Amino acid sequence: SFFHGVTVTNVDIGARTIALPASSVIGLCDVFTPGAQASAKPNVPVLLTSKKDAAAAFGIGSSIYLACEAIYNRAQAVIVAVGVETAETPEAQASAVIGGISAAGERTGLQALLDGKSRFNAQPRLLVAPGHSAQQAVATAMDGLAEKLRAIAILDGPNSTDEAAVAYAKNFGSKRLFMVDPGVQVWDSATNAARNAPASAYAAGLFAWTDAEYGFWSSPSNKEIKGVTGTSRPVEFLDGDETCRANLLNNANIATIIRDDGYRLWGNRTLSSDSKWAFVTRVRTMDLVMDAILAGHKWAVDRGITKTYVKDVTEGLRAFMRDLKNQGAVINFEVYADPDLNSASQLAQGKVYWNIRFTDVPPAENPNFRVEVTDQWLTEVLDVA
Amino acid sequence: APGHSAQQAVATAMDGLAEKLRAIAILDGPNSTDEAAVAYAKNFGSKRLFMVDPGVQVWDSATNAARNAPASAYAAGLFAWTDAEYGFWSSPSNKEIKGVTGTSRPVEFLDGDETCRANLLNNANIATI
Amino acid sequence: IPQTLTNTNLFIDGVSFAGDVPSLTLPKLAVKTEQYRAGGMDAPVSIDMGLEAMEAKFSTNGARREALNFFGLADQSAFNGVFRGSFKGQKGASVPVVATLRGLLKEVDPGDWKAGEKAEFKYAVAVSYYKLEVDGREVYEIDPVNGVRAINGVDQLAGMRNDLGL
Amino acid sequence: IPQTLTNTNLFIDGVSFAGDVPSLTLPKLAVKTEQYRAGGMDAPVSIDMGLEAMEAKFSTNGARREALNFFGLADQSAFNGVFRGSFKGQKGASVPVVATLRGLLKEVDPGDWKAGEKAEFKYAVAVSYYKLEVDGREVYEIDPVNGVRAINGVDQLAGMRNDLGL
Amino acid sequence: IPQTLTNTNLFIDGVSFAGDVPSLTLPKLAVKTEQYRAGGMDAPVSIDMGLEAMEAKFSTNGARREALNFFGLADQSAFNGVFRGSFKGQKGASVPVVATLRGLLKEVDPGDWKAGEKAEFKYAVAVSYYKLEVDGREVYEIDPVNGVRAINGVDQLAGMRNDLGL
């Protein structure tokens, strides 16, 4: 039928969440139950642009959907979700999420995220696995994948205690891995009670928003995790070194969630044995800078080498690089065509080399407000005057 | 020869003919898996033969559903276009296959050597999409 | 030591125009001056006030496509192009002079088609970025949207960059 | 790869002027620029502000009627006309360059009748619509009353069309 | 079909100037345009705003009397005159082009009398009325003080005549 008029339809639609649209895509891997409505064959990476798609694709009461909402609440970003059918044991669950080649048909589990590009152009820049992450196995898989991807993999360590979290963080040191310990505690309206989330979803979501309204090269350190209320464990944070629980976790290279009712994130640092890659800002810059370069030098990867090929590229690089400098992304740079390598042999075999040494924006951290309550300006007032 | 190409027999015929012709013969290997494709490519080594593994997946408007093509047709077509607006001496390596949507198997491709599915097929002398 | 210019070639996007380009023109690099006359002195003196609008112009006399297909392109400063020019010199060894200039194509002027005369299209890129090299050595690099007027390395705006806080 | 223009022909309303048209002139496609100098930078840069008033002009030197009979015609943009021009090229195969331009005839200038010199009328169509093709391939299509400045297919005003809500 | 102008003759008041008139010039019929750029569009378009001041000019190089004796004549538009011009055409049959133009003589310019050069007077009638015919067929008829701009019969101001109530 086709009604001709203006249907006044009484229906509960609980408040537009609102969310600034972002770009940085998110590789989500969680669990769910393939029912009649949740139209999404378990190991098939689907694409999501809004909660409505998340619902139609995954049981409204699925862990997938919970993470999807945790992202959207912050920023309307493009997500690549993979519905790992709920297994039984923790071992089976972990294995089913990690996946692999297994079924000759396609790459299951987290490996399905490698189909993100070529399927929907949604090459995950931010890997996330809600809960399935306490397990050292899944985290190792996340790290390896994250490398084979150049994507910040956002872990959530053992929610319980801090000793466990620290002990867990010491197991890593892999550049890409960026951990968030305190499992967020958000008030689920549905059951009308404090739910318990794994935190990684909210971190990734805010990561996307930070890439947009601030820059991919700006840390998400001090940014406000939209939605949510408290955590599953009150995080302490004060000044003066001390055993401030925050200072502790942010000296084992872990990000926490501080201030009233899960106000904001806290920690630009990342799990890395190498001090040079201590800042996520450093890693993310070094990665996405190149994403912009390649998505722009596509033409340069074929084509009959001419006399001017080397120059076309070294200038094309100086264009994208310069633009990034203009909009803050970096601070100076230097591109040229490494001579001690460019040869007749390499050129006949297609290859050729260039250098792109540059500097990245150091995120201001640890402002040291030194203060002295003196009695210098005392006579200057009060006495007589 | 669309589809009729998984068969080692037809491919051998294509190669012989292609020689007696000086014409790039565009094969499409076994659409399923990559191990089969690689194993199949190792059976050849004939100059003219140029294989394209991932069977393209184009949305047929007629039946209103994702068809499954053998890929060789689209490769040859784009080969022609590359000969024109670029030169017969310019590779079709990085050129855009007009029409079509996804493939019958998501092809991975990244940087840093690795087991990048593309890097794999392009080290067994096979073109991907 | 007579130098003089012998041959010339013009690139747009790698595509050589080895053929149609009977005239090139590098952007006349001019300062803004403003003749400063003031107290205590007769006769002005003139001040560095920044540069003038660098515009470069070539003029292929063929319907070249590769050039025409940059006109009014939404993305100002997409047109790149490199103006190479070989200076002979009486003693043989030629000095390569080459001037890359990322800019906006701006305008295109096909003159009087006369059925018996080289039609001669014309072009006039409003130059944004511009690096002029001589013998493979940077002589100029003028970048407005950044403030990088750098005579052979030394950046003459390095001092104003700080005062502006850029 | 020398191209150059060899022969030229001019249509008005299908009627070929294979005869009197010793000069054509396509509309000089120019952008409006406005040399943008502003905070943080010396040296301007220039901005796409839209195009300039495209005017085309031919000049039959015969009392041709078929041309004169469009002047000041109430229905501006009734005058159509197509400016074809064959570019030879040293390698034989000629490149057809053809520029249809629906516009308003605007003005007509018969110069000095001298009883011993080609009188040469003149014309200057204020071009409204204008599609320039090369080798049967759209290079330009500029339509003001619609906002359709489209370099070979891609429409550079597709982004401003939305923001204006057209 | 080459036409071109061969011979020319000039009338003032019936009196033929078969003799001194080495140059005629019909009034350059131009519209007023006004490049209309406005909301919703980049690139102007141009509008029929009425014509420009039609001025015609001949230049007898003899002290002719019959011409000089219309200058500044109280009754503007008393000077009549007809500018005839025969276009040959390669196929023999010549096309009579004739342009009657009732106007005001306006000015007279005798140039440098040099005792060894055609003195050449000059004239410049500010044309009021003007009917240009080709092959005995009205092509133009422009009458300002009446509003009768009529391309070959059809009157393009027939629509504005009503709205003004004339």
Oligomeric grouping of the chains? part of a larger assembly
DSSP, total strands of chain A? 14
Structural class of chain A: alpha/beta
Bin the helical content of chain A.
25-40%
Major beta-sheet overview of chain C: 5 strands, antiparallel
Total helical segments of chain C: 1
State Rg of chain A.
Answer: 24 Å
Rg for CA atoms of chain C: 19 Å
| Major sheet description of chain A | 6 strands, mixed
Query: Topology as H/E string of chain A?
Result: EEEHHEEHHEHEHEEEHHEEHHEHE
Sequence of secondary-structure elements of chain C = EEEEEEEEH
Q: State the helical fraction of chain C.
A: under 10%
Q: What is the beta-strand fraction of chain A?
A: 5-15%
Largest interface: C-D, 49 and 50 residues
Strand segment tally of chain C? 8
Pfam family, one (chains C, D, E): Phage_tube
Organism (chains C, D, E): Pseudomonas aeruginosa
Protein name (chains C, D, E): FIIR2 protein
InterPro entries (chains C, D, E): Tail_sheath_structural, Tail_tube
What does this 3D model show about the protein?
This is part of a larger assembly, with two copies of chain A and three copies of chain C (166 residues). The longest helix of chain A is centred in the C-terminal third of the chain and has 18 residues, at 309-326. In chain A, the strands form five sheets. In chain A, strands 3-5-2-6-7-8 form a six-stranded mixed beta sheet, sandwiched between helices. In chain A, strands 1-4 form a two-stranded parallel sheet. In chain A, strands 9-10 form a two-stranded antiparallel sheet. Chain A is built from eleven helices and 14 strands. Chain A folds into two domains: 13-273, no CATH class; 274-362, no CATH class. Chain A is an alpha/beta fold. In chain A, strand 9 and strand 10 form a beta hairpin. Helices cover 27% and strands 12% of the residues of chain A. With 166 residues, chain C is mainly beta. Chain C has one domain (1-166). Helix content of chain C is 4%, strand content 21%. Chain C contains one helix and eight strands, in the order E-E-E-E-E-E-E-E-H. Chain C has one helix at 158-164, and strands at residues 5-11, 82-87, 95-100, 103-104, 107-108, 126-127, 130-134, 138-142. In chain C, the strands form two sheets. Chain C has a five-stranded antiparallel beta sheet, with no helix packed on it. A two-stranded antiparallel ribbon of chain C has the order 4-6. In chain C, strand 2 and strand 3 (95-100) form a beta hairpin. Chain C is globular. Chains A and B meet through helix 4 of A and loops of B. Strand 5 of chain C pairs antiparallel with strand 2 of chain D.
